Design a protein around this nucleic acid. Sequence first.
RNA 1: UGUCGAACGGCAAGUGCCCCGAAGCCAUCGCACGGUGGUUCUCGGCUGAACUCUAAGCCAGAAGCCAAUCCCAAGACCAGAUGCCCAC
Length: 95
Amino acid sequence: MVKVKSLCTLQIPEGVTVDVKGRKVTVTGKRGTLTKDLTHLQLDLRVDKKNRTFTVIRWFGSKIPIACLNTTKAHVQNMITGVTKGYRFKVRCAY
RNA sequence: UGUCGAACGGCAAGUGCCCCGAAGCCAUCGCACGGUGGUUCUCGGCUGAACUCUAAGCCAGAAGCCAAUCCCAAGACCAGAUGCCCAC
């Protein structure tokens, strides 16, 4: 029924700094800044050191509690990347 | 037509009949007026986990509902505001 699988980790290099305050994430860089919200079941966001590691542990787990962990992993890396690299969007037409 | 002696003037015909008739009332027979904000689902879609719309994070919008304009109004008992004032 219920089990545990693993833990999720992200490294935070120079040029990017992440907080943990009110369990929310602040990521800044040298090309832009962005902050948002990533709450979910058993998903308590705690950043260990200021520039060491973004860790998000859950203690319970099932198909739904575990199909929601690594989406914050999909939504924390692009915080750290967009503040340094950024992704451009292009649009075309025809006539 | 009848009728007051006859005109004048009326009157009777439960308003004689007729033409016109203000006022009032009234006609899709006349006339005026009745084009507003959110919210969500269909849905186009975003990120991507475990590649796509959604499992969490999400814009967006027709109706829809919801208030609002509108009609009623505290037996919703208004410690709403306010005017005025007694005897004992």
